[PDB]
Design a protein around this ligand. Structure first.
Ligand SMILES: Nc1ncnc2c1ncn2[C@@H]1O[C@H](COP(=O)(O)OP(=O)(O)OP(=O)(O)O)[C@@H](O)[C@H]1O
Lengths: 274, 277, 771
């Protein structure tokens, strides 16, 4: 079935800039602008969430029942796939979490919200992280110059000669809204509440950890100011003149949006529910 | 022929230009999502059996680009006699980099007239070196997986030569259903006109699976996993060649799933008068 | 010796008297001196067929065809029934070779050969030894007759031990008579060897036509359409050598590049041996394009249709639709081989055949009875290495980590690459013999290594003309390949990770892809088979034999000051992937790829005398970048430098505005001027910056940040100001006098500003001294 496509639309302010690299330079597609690639947003948004359930696997264990045969760890000591520690998927050097079957990944709370592949599994990610693309304040700011990037130089200071060395970084300018969006499929309506609560949990792991490259020394510190929770149930596509949910927008802090107004926002979408 | 167009305003990168059959796959999954399980292309069999999809280029402005009438490649030197005797090399601009043309250089790129090639092509086939990360530690693993990237005001479109009842019943709801990030999609309908002379032999405007009738045609090979098990190679005519000895090359049933996937390739005409052959 | 073994030699030695005549051995014409040179050679090798070839030397300074009743007297005095011939069966072939010499084209002795590209300049006499100093067209010098005498003596040395068949007389005369002038006249750009080749070709075609002296003496053979121009194009070469994923290494790429030329030579040799024609009936075979002058019977068309259907079906079954062969023939007349009535009948016939070839290459794979059919088979999976991409489970994992299943073609090809340094040649045998490594459309190949002795009646020997240690049963077929590659510590082919470690600067891989410019128009201007043969063979010898000379460090006396990123070493880090026909594609370390581009361009500017040019795209990638992206980048870059001025290099992908005034490419006289201007001021040798910019090495990085303002808008004027704001802060007042003041000279004629062009000189230094 399909009763889906929730649109979280918003703006992400990089309070100290970003360094989604590619001198290391930011991703610059066709106009010279930078942009958050939606790959990096989904990727960091799953690393934080996967390490959250790595800590919390032994205690949920009844909710999300397929996340019980793991017993936390990485399978880098015993160099094999399918080892029950938490996560195998040896790509070239790394070890990420992907459930190796569809029947399991209908229940793993990380894996059923960003998908599964490998051999004979093929789970779709249930989410579409649109690349964020520099909302129209900073586009018109860019047209008169304003230097949308910022070359920032660090050094490797020694302690026996106290020498140094240029390691330039060229990060995005601190303070820039990016027109952030999230599209989410709402298959399996009984999963949905905990699912978007989990996505908001992973987004709330951001604003307190690093996006974008050489973090933990600056360079991250992003802020989602997301305006419009929407809905596109089954009548926005066969029609679309009217009849879709538009939620409250202005000052929705994500550490307060997560439940202190969410069930006041959930129950309107319970009004359609079909 | 007053066939309408569907302009797809992107918001970012695509994986590839959708190759005139992958839309009919995507239309199939769209009407598989909406309308239950039996209003899907089994029900739309006799409705695409008189109406075609036939994808084409981006536009870069509003200039709706169109691929090539491939019946100018034989007698290109018969076209460009008006130029000076250094016309060869403009033929190499109109043979080797012959990719896409403006409409005004397409109503007369056929019908044996001296067209002019454009150069404002909205391609950035860039080499985006994506993801490298392990959940605990380093990962080196630069795996490329390049994608296409557009201009500032551009976007793909495609055509529709069919009755508008069938358009607004299946495809036009589906063209707003489509809107990892590369599915960036805003739909804006339109109409269009093409001069299109007498219909002896003329263009297909799609990727094409013909009924055994070869006339001056680039060959293609299109894979496609299409719900898991790898689809076969399914040799195709490329975008815009000339098979008009009464086409109607039917869609091909496949195997691998519970319900069959069946691949597009049925074409719709235009107007060309080709020199000889 | 039958009539064809007589005729193909008599068309090959009908002008053998001209190197003897200008060397001073006897008196008379070039006819009697050649027969007098030959008439002692029959008493040397014992075979009395050389005395019979003296009759084919006995044609010119004519009026002997009024003396024809005395010509039967001179024939009967040699008894041609000693080899199974009659009088008229020799006389007919004599008149055939007389007619054929008039179908090769429409004074002072020492006049040299004029070069085919610039008809003014000329070569000294040299030898086709690619491990030596190689000719360049210089000013018009009289060829010293003692060098002709040394040529005659070495011909006497190398004609006795050579066999009396065409397969040995072809490379022996090609080694010595290549650069000798055929006709000593001004503007004669026709080689002696190519005139001999086309004469033997047209003579064997007219012998297999059925025309005799009853038809030659009437002058009817020029009007009767008794010939066939058979051209064949390999369409899809770029999608065959290069569509290779990241698992494919450089050994496998060079193996595919050899494999394509092997398939081409198999089709050419099958058309040669199924018609009855020697290697003289091939005008050129290069770049997958070949042209054959053949006879015109109702059955030869049937043989060609059988060959075409066979080769196209083998290509479609083996490599699904990624390598098509278009073999189209046009029945031409003898009138269409010359310049008659002012117009160019040969170029018009070739243009008609090329139009038929383009019509064919549109209808690609037009002869497959089940091409467009349904009902595809089961259990199909593409291999990761090739894009052959439709076997069944036949594909076999080997020659690597044996868990990745792999097609048998690329199973054989890495094994070919493991023998590729020590390979001496191939042997064209039947497809089901011992040691058959690769197949073809008709014939398998046995890799002739450094000790073996294979035979399949044809031996494809690489890069040489001396056959040496191969038996006297097989047909010795030479073929040239630009072969140079950096050997590893073992001796094998270095990979990309083995090559880019020798990069003076950043670790990046340099990839170069070129083309000769406006060459298709250059071959619609030659109005003889002789001129086409010379103008194709001299072009192909550059991109198949000269490349290994320029990479090895030779030709320094005319190359001179190219952009020198470093010292040019003894063994470069340069691996030639595929150089042939016109184009050339070379990977390696980028610091030597860069120098190789300008070395190739300036040596080619010397080699054609400036009448031709070459476009070159360049690219720098990571060592782990897939080769198909590594070729699709430089193909787009070569096409962009092709479109925007036709004679231009693409050094590095730069940012530009969108107005049509800023061109991405570079003229060579622009870029070499710029590297003569801005590089020795700011860059020292061997990866170290200049002593003024020492310890202030972040200065040149700031100029690109300056130049980005000019990139974002051309009309503003901030760039020339902030350049002086940078250069004043470090004292370097003089290093950029062009960048500080906006030049009115460029804005007069709507040319871009002088800060647009300097960054292509900056970044290549910035990649050179990065760490
Ligand atoms: N060594 C060669 N000998 C004979 N013919 C050649 C050779 N190299 C290339 N050709 C011919 O050149 C043709 C294609 O060359 P190419 O397209 O580069 O010509 P061009 O005039 O340079 O065109 P462009 O400038 O568009 O590249 C082929 O048909 C091929 O037959």
């Amino acid at each position: 079935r399909f009763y889906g496509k929730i649109v979280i639309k918003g703006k992400i302010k990089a309070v100290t800039g970003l360094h989604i690299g590619s001198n290391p330079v930011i991703k610059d597609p066709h106009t010279g602008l930078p942009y958050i690639p939606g790959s990096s947003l989904k990727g960091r948004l799953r690393s934080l969430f996967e390490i959250l359930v790595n800590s919390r696997l032994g205690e949920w264990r009844e909710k999300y029942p397929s996340l019980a045969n793991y017993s936390p760890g990485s399978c880098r000591p015993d160099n094999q796939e399918n080892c029950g520690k938490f996560f195998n998927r040896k790509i070239n050097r790394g070890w990420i979490h992907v459930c190796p079957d569809y029947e399991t990944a209908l229940a793993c709370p990380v894996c059923r919200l960003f998908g599964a592949s490998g051999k004979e599994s093929n789970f779709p990610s249930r989410i579409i992280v649109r690349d964020a693309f520099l909302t129209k304040e900073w586009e018109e700011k860019w047209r008169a110059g304003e230097a949308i990037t910022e070359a920032k130089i660090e050094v490797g200071i020694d302690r026996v000669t106290s020498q140094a060395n240029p390691r330039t970084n060229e990060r995005v300018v601190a303070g820039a809204e990016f027109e952030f969006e999230i599209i989410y499929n709402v298959e399996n309506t009984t999963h949905w509440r905990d699912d978007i609560k989990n996505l908001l949990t992973a987004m709330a792991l951001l604003e307190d950890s690093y996006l974008g490259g050489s973090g933990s020394r600056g360079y991250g510190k992003v802020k989602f100011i997301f305006d419009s929770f929407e809905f596109r149930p089954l009548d926005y596509y066969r029609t679309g003149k009217d009849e879709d949910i538009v939620s409250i927008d202005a000052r929705e802090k994500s550490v307060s949006d997560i439940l202190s107004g969410f069930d006041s926002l959930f129950s309107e979408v319970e009004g359609k529910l079909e | 022929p007053k066939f309408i167009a569907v302009k797809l305003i992107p918001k970012g990168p695509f994986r590839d230009i959708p190759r005139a059959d992958t839309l009919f796959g995507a239309i199939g999954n769209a009407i598989s999502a909406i309308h239950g399980q039996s209003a899907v292309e089994e029900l739309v069999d006799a409705f695409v059996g008189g109406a075609r999809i036939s994808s084409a280029f981006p536009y870069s402005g509003d200039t709706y680009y169109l691929p090539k009438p491939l019946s100018v490649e034989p007698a290109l030197e018969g076209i460009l006699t008006g130029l000076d005797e250094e016309e060869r090399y403009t033929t190499a601009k109109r043979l080797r980099k012959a990719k896409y043309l403006d409409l005004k250089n397409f109503e007369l790129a056929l019908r044996l007239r001296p067209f002019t090639i454009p150069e404002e092509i909205p391609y950035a086939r860039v080499d985006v070196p994506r993801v490298v990360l392990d959940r605990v530690t380093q990962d080196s693993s630069i795996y490329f997986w390049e994608e296409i990237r557009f201009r500032e005001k551009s976007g793909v479109y495609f055509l529709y030569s069919g009755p508008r009842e069938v358009f607004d019943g299946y495809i036009a709801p589906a063209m707003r259903f489509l809107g990892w990030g590369a599915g960036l999609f805003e739909v804006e309908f339109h109409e269009m006109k093409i001069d299109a002379p007498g219909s002896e032999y003329s263009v297909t405007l799609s990727n094409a699976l013909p009924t055994k009738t070869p006339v001056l045609w680039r060959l293609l090979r299109k894979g496609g996993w299409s719900f898991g098990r790898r689809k076969p190679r399914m040799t195709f005519i490329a975008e815009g060649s000339i098979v008009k000895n009464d086409p109607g090359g039917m869609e091909r049933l496949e195997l691998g799933l519970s319900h069959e996937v069946y691949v597009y390739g049925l074409t719709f005409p235009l107007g060309v008068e080709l020199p000889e052959g | 010796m039958e009539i064809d073994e007589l005729t193909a030699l008599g068309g090959l030695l009908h002008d053998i008297g001209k190197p003897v005549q200008r060397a001073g051995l006897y008196s008379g014409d070039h006819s009697t001196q050649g027969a007098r040179f030959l008439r002692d050679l029959a008493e040397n090798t014992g075979r009395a067929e050389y005395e019979l070839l003296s009759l084919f030397s006995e044609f010119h300074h004519k009026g002997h065809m009024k003396n024809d009743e005395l010509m039967i007297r001179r024939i009967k005095e040699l008894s041609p029934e000693r080899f199974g011939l009659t009088m008229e069966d020799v006389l007919n072939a004599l008149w055939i070779v007389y007619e054929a010499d008039n179908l090769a084209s429409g004074p002072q002795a020492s006049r040299p050969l004029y070069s085919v590209f610039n008809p003014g300049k000329a070569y000294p006499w040299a030898e086709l030894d690619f491990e030596k100093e190689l000719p360049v067209p210089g000013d018009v010098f009289s060829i010293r007759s003692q060098d002709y005498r040394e040529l005659v003596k070495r011909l006497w040395e190398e004609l006795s031990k050579a066999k009396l068949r065409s397969d040995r007389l072809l490379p022996v005369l090609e080694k010595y008579l290549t650069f000798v002038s055929s006709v000593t006249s001004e503007g004669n750009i026709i080689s002696l060897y190519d005139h001999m080749r086309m004469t033997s070709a047209i003579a064997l075609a007219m012998l297999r036509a059925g025309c005799t002296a009853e038809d030659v003496r009437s002058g009817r053979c020029r009007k009767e359409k008794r010939f066939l121009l058979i051209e064949g194009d390999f369409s899809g070469i770029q999608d065959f050598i290069y569509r290779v994923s990241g698992k494919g290494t450089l050994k496998y790429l060079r193996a595919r590049s050899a494999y394509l030329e092997l398939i081409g030579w198999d089709v050419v040799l099958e058309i040669l041996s199924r018609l009855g024609l020697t290697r003289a009936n091939v005008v050129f075979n290069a770049g997958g394009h070949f042209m054959i002058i053949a006879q015109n019977t109702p059955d030869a068309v049937k043989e060609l249709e059988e060959i075409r259907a066979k080769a196209v079906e083998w290509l479609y079954r083996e490599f699904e639709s990624d390598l098509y062969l278009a073999i189209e023939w046009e029945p031409v007349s003898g009138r269409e081989f010359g310049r008659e009535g002012g117009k160019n009948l040969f170029a018009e016939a070739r243009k008609r055949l090329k139009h038929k070839l383009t019509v064919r290459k549109l209808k690609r794979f037009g002869e497959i009875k089940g091409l467009f059919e349904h009902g595809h088979t089961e259990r199909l999976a593409e291999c990761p290495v090739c894009g052959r991409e439709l076997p069944e489970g036949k594909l076999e994992p080997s020659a690597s980590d044996p868990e990745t299943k792999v097609c048998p073609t690329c199973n054989r090809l890495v094994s070919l690459g493991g023998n590729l340094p020590k390979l001496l040649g191939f042997g064209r045998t039947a497809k089901n013999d011992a040691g058959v490594l690769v197949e073809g459309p008709f014939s398998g190949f046995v890799p002739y290594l450094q000790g073996g002795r294979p035979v399949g009646e044809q031996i494809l020997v690489k890069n040489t003309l001396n056959p040496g240690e191969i038996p006297e049963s097989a047909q010795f077929v030479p073929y040239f390949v630009a072969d140079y590659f950096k050997k590893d510590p073992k001796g094998g082919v270095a990979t990309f990770e083995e090559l880019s470690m020798a990069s003076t600067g950043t670790r990046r891989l340099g990839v170069m892809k070129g083309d000769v410019d406006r060459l298709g128009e250059f071959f619609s201007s030659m109005d003889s088979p002789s001129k086409l043969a010379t103008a194709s063979r001299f072009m192909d010898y550059f991109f198949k034999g000269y490349i290994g000379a320029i990479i090895e460090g030779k030709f320094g006396y005319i190359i001179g000051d190219v952009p020198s990123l470093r010292d040019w070493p003894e063994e470069p880090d340069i691996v030639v992937v595929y150089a042939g026909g016109d184009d050339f594609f070379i990977v390696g370390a980028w610091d030597q790829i860069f120098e190789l581009a300008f070395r190739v361009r300036r040596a080619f500017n010397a080699y054609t005398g400036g009448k031709l040019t070459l476009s070159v795209g360049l690219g720098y990638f990571d060592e782990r970048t897939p080769i198909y992206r590594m070729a699709d980048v430089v193909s787009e870059r070569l096409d962009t430098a092709k479109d925007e001025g036709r004679n231009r290099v693409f050094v590095v992908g730069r940012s530009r505005p969108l107005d049509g005034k800023h061109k991405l490419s570079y003229e060579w006289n622009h870029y070499e001027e710029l590297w003569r201007t801005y590089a020795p001021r700011i860059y020292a040798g061997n990866g170290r910056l200049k002593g003024k910019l020492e310890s202030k090495k972040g200065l040149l990085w700031k100029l690109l940040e300056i130049r980005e303002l000019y990139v974002r808008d051309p009309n503003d004027v901030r760039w020339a100001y902030l350049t002086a704001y940078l250069l004043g802060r470090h004292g370097l007042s003089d290093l950029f006098p062009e960048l500080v003041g906006i030049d009115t000279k460029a804005v007069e004629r709507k040319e871009p500003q002088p800060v647009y062009w300097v960054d292509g000189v900056l970044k290549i230094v910035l990649m050179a001294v990065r760490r």
